[PDB]
Amino acid sequence: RSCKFSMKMKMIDSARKQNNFSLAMKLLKELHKESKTRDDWLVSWVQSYCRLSHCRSRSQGCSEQVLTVLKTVSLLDENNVSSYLSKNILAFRDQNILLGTTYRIIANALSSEPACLAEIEEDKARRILELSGSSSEDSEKVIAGLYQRAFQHLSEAVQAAEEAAGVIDAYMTLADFCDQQLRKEEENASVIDSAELQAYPALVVEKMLKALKLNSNEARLKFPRLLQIIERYPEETLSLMTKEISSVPCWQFISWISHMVALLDKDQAVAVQHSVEEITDNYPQAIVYPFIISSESYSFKDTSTGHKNKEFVARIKSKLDQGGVIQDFINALDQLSNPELLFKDWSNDVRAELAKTPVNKKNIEKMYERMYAALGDPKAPGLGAFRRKFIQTFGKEFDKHFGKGGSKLLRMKLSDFNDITNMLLLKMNKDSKPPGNLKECSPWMSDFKVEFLRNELEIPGQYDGRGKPLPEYHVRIAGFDERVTVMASLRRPKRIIIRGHDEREHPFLVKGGEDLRQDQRVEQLFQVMNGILAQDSACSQRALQLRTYSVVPMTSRLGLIEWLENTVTLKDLLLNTMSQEEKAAYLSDPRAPPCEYKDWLTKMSGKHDVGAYMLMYKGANRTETVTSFRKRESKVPADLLKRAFVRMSTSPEAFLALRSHFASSHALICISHWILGIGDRHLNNFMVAMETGGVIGIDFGHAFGSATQFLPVPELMPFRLTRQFINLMLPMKETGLMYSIMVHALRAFRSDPGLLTNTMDVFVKEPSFDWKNFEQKMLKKGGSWIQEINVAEKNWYPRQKICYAKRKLAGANPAVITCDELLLGHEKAPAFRDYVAVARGSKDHNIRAQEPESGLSEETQVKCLMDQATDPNILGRTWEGWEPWM
Amino acid sequence: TKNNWEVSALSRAAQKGFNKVVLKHLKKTKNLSSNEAISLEEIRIRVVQMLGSLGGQINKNLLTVTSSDEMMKSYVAWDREKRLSFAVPFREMKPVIFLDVFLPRVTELALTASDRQTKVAACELLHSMVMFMLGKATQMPEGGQGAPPMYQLYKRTFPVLLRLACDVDQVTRQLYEPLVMQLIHWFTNNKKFESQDTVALLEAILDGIVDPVDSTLRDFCGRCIREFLKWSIKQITPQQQEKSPVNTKSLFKRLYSLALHPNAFKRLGASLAFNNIYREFREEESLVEQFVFEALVIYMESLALAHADEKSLGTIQQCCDAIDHLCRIIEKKHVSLNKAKKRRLPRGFPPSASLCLLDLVKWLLAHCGRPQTECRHKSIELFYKFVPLLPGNRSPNLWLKDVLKEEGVSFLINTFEGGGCGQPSGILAQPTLLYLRGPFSLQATLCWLDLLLAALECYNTFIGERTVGALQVLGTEAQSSLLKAVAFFLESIAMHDIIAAEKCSPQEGERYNYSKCTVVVRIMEFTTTLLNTSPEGWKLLKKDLCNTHLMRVLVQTLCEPASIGFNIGDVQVMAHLPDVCVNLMKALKMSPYKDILETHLREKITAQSIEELCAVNL
Numbered sequence A: 001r002s003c004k005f006s007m008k009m010k011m012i013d014s015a016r017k018q019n020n021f022s023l024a025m026k027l028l029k030e031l032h033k034e035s036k037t038r039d040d041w042l043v044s045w046v047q048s049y050c051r052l053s054h055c056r057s058r059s060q061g062c063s064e065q066v067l068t069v070l071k072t073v074s075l076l077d078e079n080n081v082s083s084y085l086s087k088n089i090l091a092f093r094d095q096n097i098l099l100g101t102t103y104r105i106i107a108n109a110l111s112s113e114p115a116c117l118a119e120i121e122e123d124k125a126r127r128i129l130e131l132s133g134s135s136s137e138d139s140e141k142v143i144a145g146l147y148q149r150a151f152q153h154l155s156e157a158v159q160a161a162e163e164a165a166g167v168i169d170a171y172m173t174l175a176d177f178c179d180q181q182l183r184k185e186e187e188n189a190s191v192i193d194s195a196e197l198q199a200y201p202a203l204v205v206e207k208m209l210k211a212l213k214l215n216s217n218e219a220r221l222k223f224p225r226l227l228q229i230i231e232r233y234p235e236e237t238l239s240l241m242t243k244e245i246s247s248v249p250c251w252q253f254i255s256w257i258s259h260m261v262a263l264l265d266k267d268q269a270v271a272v273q274h275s276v277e278e279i280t281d282n283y284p285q286a287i288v289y290p291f292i293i294s295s296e297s298y299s300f301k302d303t304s305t306g307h308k309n310k311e312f313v314a315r316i317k318s319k320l321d322q323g324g325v326i327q328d329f330i331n332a333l334d335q336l337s338n339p340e341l342l343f344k345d346w347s348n349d350v351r352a353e354l355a356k357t358p359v360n361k362k363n364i365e366k367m368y369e370r371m372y373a374a375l376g377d378p379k380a381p382g383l384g385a386f387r388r389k390f391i392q393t394f395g396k397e398f399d400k401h402f403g404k405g406g407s408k409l410l411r412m413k414l415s416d417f418n419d420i421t422n423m424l425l426l427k428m429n430k431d432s433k434p435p436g437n438l439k440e441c442s443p444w445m446s447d448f449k450v451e452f453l454r455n456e457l458e459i460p461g462q463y464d465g466r467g468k469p470l471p472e473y474h475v476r477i478a479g480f481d482e483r484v485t486v487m488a489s490l491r492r493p494k495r496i497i498i499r500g501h502d503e504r505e506h507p508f509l510v511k512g513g514e515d516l517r518q519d520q521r522v523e524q525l526f527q528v529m530n531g532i533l534a535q536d537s538a539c540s541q542r543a544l545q546l547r548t549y550s551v552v553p554m555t556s557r558l559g560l561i562e563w564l565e566n567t568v569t570l571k572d573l574l575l576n577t578m579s580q581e582e583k584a585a586y587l588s589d590p591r592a593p594p595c596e597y598k599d600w601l602t603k604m605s606g607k608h609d610v611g612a613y614m615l616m617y618k619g620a621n622r623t624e625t626v627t628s629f630r631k632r633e634s635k636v637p638a639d640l641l642k643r644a645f646v647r648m649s650t651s652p653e654a655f656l657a658l659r660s661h662f663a664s665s666h667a668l669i670c671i672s673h674w675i676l677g678i679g680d681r682h683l684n685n686f687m688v689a690m691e692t693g694g695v696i697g698i699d700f701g702h703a704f705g706s707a708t709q710f711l712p713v714p715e716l717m718p719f720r721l722t723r724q725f726i727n728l729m730l731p732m733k734e735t736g737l738m739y740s741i742m743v744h745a746l747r748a749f750r751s752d753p754g755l756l757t758n759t760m761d762v763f764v765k766e767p768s769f770d771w772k773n774f775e776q777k778m779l780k781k782g783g784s785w786i787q788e789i790n791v792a793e794k795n796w797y798p799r800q801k802i803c804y805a806k807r808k809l810a811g812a813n814p815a816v817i818t819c820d821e822l823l824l825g826h827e828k829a830p831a832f833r834d835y836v837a838v839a840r841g842s843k844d845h846n847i848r849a850q851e852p853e854s855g856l857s858e859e860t861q862v863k864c865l866m867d868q869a870t871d872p873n874i875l876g877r878t879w880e881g882w883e884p885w886m
Numbered sequence B: 001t002k003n004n005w006e007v008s009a010l011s012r013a014a015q016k017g018f019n020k021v022v023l024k025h026l027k028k029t030k031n032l033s034s035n036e037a038i039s040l041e042e043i044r045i046r047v048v049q050m051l052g053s054l055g056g057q058i059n060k061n062l063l064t065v066t067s068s069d070e071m072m073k074s075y076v077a078w079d080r081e082k083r084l085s086f087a088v089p090f091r092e093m094k095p096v097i098f099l100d101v102f103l104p105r106v107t108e109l110a111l112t113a114s115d116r117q118t119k120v121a122a123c124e125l126l127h128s129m130v131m132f133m134l135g136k137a138t139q140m141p142e143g144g145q146g147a148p149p150m151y152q153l154y155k156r157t158f159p160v161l162l163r164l165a166c167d168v169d170q171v172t173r174q175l176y177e178p179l180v181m182q183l184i185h186w187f188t189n190n191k192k193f194e195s196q197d198t199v200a201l202l203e204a205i206l207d208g209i210v211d212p213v214d215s216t217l218r219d220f221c222g223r224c225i226r227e228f229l230k231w232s233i234k235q236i237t238p239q240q241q242e243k244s245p246v247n248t249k250s251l252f253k254r255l256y257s258l259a260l261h262p263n264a265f266k267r268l269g270a271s272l273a274f275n276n277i278y279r280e281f282r283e284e285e286s287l288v289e290q291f292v293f294e295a296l297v298i299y300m301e302s303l304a305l306a307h308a309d310e311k312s313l314g315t316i317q318q319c320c321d322a323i324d325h326l327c328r329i330i331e332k333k334h335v336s337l338n339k340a341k342k343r344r345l346p347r348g349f350p351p352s353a354s355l356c357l358l359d360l361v362k363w364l365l366a367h368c369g370r371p372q373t374e375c376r377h378k379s380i381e382l383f384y385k386f387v388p389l390l391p392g393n394r395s396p397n398l399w400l401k402d403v404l405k406e407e408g409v410s411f412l413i414n415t416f417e418g419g420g421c422g423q424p425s426g427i428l429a430q431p432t433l434l435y436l437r438g439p440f441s442l443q444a445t446l447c448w449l450d451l452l453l454a455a456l457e458c459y460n461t462f463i464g465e466r467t468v469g470a471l472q473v474l475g476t477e478a479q480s481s482l483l484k485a486v487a488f489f490l491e492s493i494a495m496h497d498i499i500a501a502e503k504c505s506p507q508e509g510e511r512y513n514y515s516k517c518t519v520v521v522r523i524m525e526f527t528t529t530l531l532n533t534s535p536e537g538w539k540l541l542k543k544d545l546c547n548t549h550l551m552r553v554l555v556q557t558l559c560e561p562a563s564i565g566f567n568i569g570d571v572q573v574m575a576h577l578p579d580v581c582v583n584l585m586k587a588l589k590m591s592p593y594k595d596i597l598e599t600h601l602r603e604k605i606t607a608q609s610i611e612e613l614c615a616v617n618l
C-alpha cells in the first residue's frame, strides 16, 4: 500500500509538470482518504495539492487566481506540526516556501486589479481580511499585510534552508520576491513604503551572492541588478556587497567583465575591485581587451576616494600587457585598414569639432596628434609596403596644405577647410589598391613567430563565462596566413586567418573605422536572451536558442569579428538557387524589380536621388503603392527557399525538419531583433548555416532604434518577413509556426521584464562613440520632446533607449513605438505626416490601427506586429538596397 | 532463423501413434540437458529487457541525438549535388539511380549489424561502391566538371573504411585491410598528391589515432601513417616534397601539436604515431638532423605532461618508448649529431644558431630535478647515455667535475633541489612544509612530496653512480636543504601523518599514502647509497638522517608495514620491501649506528613477543 501510494504521488508530480492539472486533480482527489492514515502521507499530499494549485493559478485571471489559491491556506496552518514538521527540516522548508508563494499569489492578485476583493464572495473576502491581520481598510493595508506574511514565511524558509540544489531555490525565491518589492516602489511617491522596504536590499544582495557561490545560472543572470542596486541603495549595501563578492569563485564574472571594468571609474568601484584584480591574476587574457577599450575614458573626479581608483587602474595596467605583445597585436591589426577611410573619419570628426562654438586648441591638438602619428610621421611604431606607399605620396600634401597642425589649421574656415579636404579626398579616392598578401600589409603578422621567448597570445573571443575556464584548452596564436581578401560593402573590412597552435585555420574579420562595443553589448543581450528562453518550459521544449558569435572590440576603430564557417548569406542562398534565366532576368531586365523600383520612384517623384523617396511619400496614396508593390513582387521566382531546402535535404523527413528549423529560428530572431530594435535587415545581413539550416543574424550596427531616426529614408518595418519567407511555409501561412514561436518567445521575454532592461545599464554607464555622436546629432535640431525630457539631467540618451525597450516589452503597439521614433528623429521633414500615416496603418485594412496605444496583450502584440512587417503600403516605400520584394 | 521440426526420429515415430517409442525418443532428445550457449536471439531479447529495466529516463539515451546541433547536423545530405549516378542496364531503358542515397545506410549496416549475412552483404556493397566512387572521380572530360569533386563523400567515407579495416570479423578485415593500403598507395601517387582528398584522408587517419574508445583503431591508423610516409616519400619526386600541405615537415608539426595537447588521447596518439614511423624517420638523413632534437624535447615534454593523468590510459608506456626510439636514433648518428649545424630550434631553448649534442646534454642535466617522475627518470637515463659519446669521450665523473668547477658547486645543487628549470620551485624554497600559502590543500602536499622525491632521486643517482662523491655536495659548502627536508619528513610526516597529521575523503588517503610510501622507500635507498658509497663521511647524516626517526620508520616497515601506509594490494612494492629493508639493515652493520639499530630491533622483536604470540591458540 505504501508502494502504491508513492507511485501515484510521483505520477501526480509528472502530471503537474506537464500541465495536466485536470488529471492530476483526479489522481490526487482519490488519494485524499489514504493520506490521512499517516502524517508523512498527509504532508506530502497537501504539498502536492498546494503546488498543483500554484501551477493551476497562472492561466486564470484575477477573481479566479485568488479562488484557486485561497483553498490552500485553509489546511496549512492546521496540524502535522506534531513531531513531524519539527523532525523534518526539509518538509518545514517546503511548507514555508509553499505558504509564502500562496500569500504572494494572493497579494499580487489583489494588486493589479484591487477592485476584485469583495467582487468574489463575502465569506471569502472576510477570509482575506482576517488572513492579513490588518483590519478596517479597503485596499491600503491588507495587501501590505499579505506581503508581510509572504516575506515572513520566505524568511523562515531561508532560515530552515541554511541546513546544493535545495537551498538555491529558497535563496532565489526570497531574493526574487524582495527585488520585486524593491522594484514596485519606483513609480510610487511614498516614504512610509520606502521605510518599510529599506530592510530589503541587504537581503537581496547577500542572498543572491550566496546563491551565486553555489554555482547558479539564475543568480548569474541577475548580476546587473546587483550592480544597479548600489546606485540606489549605497550606504546599507556597498560594504556588504564588497565582502559578499569575495567568497564567490573566481570565474562567475567573466561574462560580466565589461560591466565591471567600465564601472571601475564610478564612485561604486570598491565592490568590484577584488574580482577585477583576481581575474587579472588568474586569467590575464579575458580582461585585457575590455581594459584597453575601457581605459580611454575614465574621468576620475579628484576627491579623497578617487586616488585609490586611479592607483587601482594603474596597478591593473601594470599587471596586464606584460611585454607589450597585446598592444603590438593591436597596433599590427591597425595597419590593415585603408588609410583613406581613416582620413574620412578624421575629417568628419574634425568637422564635428569645428561645427561647435567656442572651438579651442585645447582639444584640436588631441585630434591632430593621432592623425600625425598614423597618417603623418613615417618613422612610425610599425608599417609595411602599403602605408609607406601612401605616406611618401600624400604626407607632403599635409605639411603645406595644413602645415604643422596646431599653428596653422586653427582658423575657423569651415567653408575653406572643407574645400581643401575635399580637394585632397577627390585624389585620395583614386589611388587606393586592394592590398595583397600580408608581406605588404603588416610585417609583424607575417613573420609573427610565436617563439620570441614565451609571449603567448590566445585567439580572442573565448572565455564564455559559464564554468571553470581551464585555460590550457584554449587555442593560442601560432602564426598567420598569407591571404587577406577585402570585401567592398561601402566600408571595407578584411578577412584574415589566425593559424592556431593545433594546426588549424581560424578565420576572423578585422574591421577598422567604427567602435564595436555596440555589437558586443547586443551579443551579450542575445546571450541573456537565450539564457532566458532555456529556463522557460515552452521554449525549452522547442529548444529555441539564438546563434551568437564572439565580438572582441580591441580599441575604438579596431575590432575582431568571429567568422562563422560553412554559412552563406541569405542573398547568396537565394541567388545560387536561381537558374540562368532567372538570375539574368533579375540582375538585368528593365522590367526586373531592381530597376522597376527606381523607374517607379522617378515616375512618382521626378527626381533621381534619395529625395525621390521623400517626394513619393507625400505624393502617393495607398493603392498606387500597393498594386505596384504586388506587380513588382510577382516578378521574382516564387519558391526559392523551398528549392534550396529540397536541394540540400535527403528525404521528406529531412525537408520538414530543415524547414521547421529555418522558420523557427528566423521567427525567434524576428522577435529578438524587435525587442532591442535592430534595423538594416537586408539579405546580406542574414546568414544561414548550411549544415543545420538555421538562421544567424549579423551586423548589429543600427542596434537600438536608429534606422528610423538617423537615416535619409526611414525603415518602418520591425523585422524581415518578405515574400520568400512566407512562401516557404506554403500551403500554410505565417499564422502557424512562425506566429506561435513568436508568441512563445515574446511571452518568455515579457515573463521577467527585468533581465533585459537591467543588462542594458552598460549602455548608459559607458556609452559608445556612436551613441554620443547620435546624442550630439540629436541635440542639434530639437523638436517636441525638448519641453518634455531633461537634457541637463544625465547622458539621457541610452536612458531613453532603455525607456523605449522597456516600454515595448511592457506591452505596446509597435505602430506607436515606430511613429514615436519618427517623431524623435524626423521632425521638420516635409513628409513627416505621411511617415506617421504610413507607419500607423489604415484603420480598416490593418490590425495595428484598431488596437490600444498600450496595455497590449501577448498574442495581440505579435498579431499587430506581423501586420506591420508584411504590409504592401510600407514595403512599397523602403530603401532600394533592402530589396523588399525578395 | 525459422528452425521447425525437420524429419527426425521423433516425427516419423510419432506419426504412427502415441506409444512407448515416442516416450523413449522424448526421454532421449528432450532429456539430453547437457548445456547450450547463448544465441543472438536470446541476446536481443535480453537487450530489450535491459532497455526496459533501465527505466524511461535512462532509456532514451540509445537515441543520443539530444543536442539540437547534432539533431540538425543529421538531416543534410552528405553532398548537395548527387554524385555517383548509375545507369542500370536493362535491355532498352538504362534508368539512373544515384548511389549517394544508399551510402549512409550501408555504412552503418556494415559497421554495426550483429547479423553476419547482412554485415557481409553490406561490406561487399560498400566495397564495390567505393570502387565506383574512385572510378567516377577520374572520368574523361575535365577535372573541374567532367570529373565530379567528391571531397564531401570522401570526408565521410574514409573513417568508415578505417573502422572496417580493424573490424573483429575475419571476412571484413580481409576485405578492407588491403583496401585502405591500396587507397593510400593511390592517394600518395603523383597524380593525386596535391589534392584536397589526400588532405581528407590524412585528416581521417590523424582523427583515427586520437579516438578515445577503440584501441584497435588507434593501432591500425598508426600503420596507416607509416604507410602514408613510406609511399609519399617514394612515389613522388624529391623537390616536390616541400611544396605540399601534407609533407613530412607539416606532418611532424601536426604530430608535435598533438603531442603537447592537454587531452590525454591526443598525446597518446602522437606517441603511437612516432612509435610507428620511427623507422622511416631514422632512414632519411636530411630530415633526421634538423628534427631529432626538436622531436626529443617535444616528446620529453609530452611525457612530463603525462604525469597528472589516470594510470590506465598508458600514455607513459607509449611516450617512454617513443623517447627510447629517439634516443637510439641519436646513438647511431652521434658522430654527426655533435657538429654545430643550424637545426630546427626546440621550444623553450634560448635562441641560438648552433645546435650540438652538448647543450642538449646540458638541457637534460638542467631538467634532472623535475617533479614529474617518469620524465625525470628518462632525463637522467638519457644524460648518462649521452655523456660517453661526445668530444673526448669522457666519463660523467670527469665531465661533471669540469662543468662543476667552471660554474660553481651550488649550480648542481640548484639543478637538484630546484624543482625543474622553468620555475624557481623545489625544496630549496621549501625544505620543510610549514608554509605552502594556503589552507593546506592536498594537491599542494603531493607537489611537495613529489619535489622531495625529485631531489632525493637526483642525489641518490648521482652519488651511487660514482659521477659525484657524496662528501662535496652534502657538506655545507653550498647550503643545500635536502637533509633538512628528509629530517622533516621522517620527523613529522613519515610515520603516521596520513590526512590527520598532514593538515597541521577516505579515497584521497590512498593517493597520499602511495606518494608517502614511495618516498619512504627512496629515503631508505638513499641512506644505503650513502653508507655503501662513502665509507668515510657518515658524520654528516647524524643530526638528521640516521637517528631514532629513521630507525623507528625502519622497524615499522620491517614488522608491520601497513601502519606506515603501505598497501598489501600492491605486490611489487611489497616484494621490494624485503630488498630495501635487508640492504639498509646490512649497510647499517658496517657503521657506528649498529648499536642503535640493535636496540631499536630489540624493543620490537623479543623472545617474550614470540612466547606471547604462540601462547595463544593458533
Ligand SMILES: Nc1ncnc2c1ncn2[C@@H]1O[C@H](COP(=O)(O)OP(=O)(O)OP(=O)(O)O)[C@@H](O)[C@H]1O
Pocket (backbone or CB within 6 Å): A487, A489, A491, A492, A493, A509, A549, A561, A562, A563, A564, A565, A569, A680, A684, A685, A698, A699, A701
Ligand atoms: N559574424 C560573421 N560571420 C561570418 N561572416 C561575416 C560575419 N560578419 C560579417 N560577415 C561577412 O562580412 C560581410 C560584411 O559584414 P558586416 O555586414 O558585419 O559588415 P558591414 O558590411 O561593414 O556592415 P553593414 O552591413 O552595416 O554595411 C558580409 O558579406 C558577411 O558575409
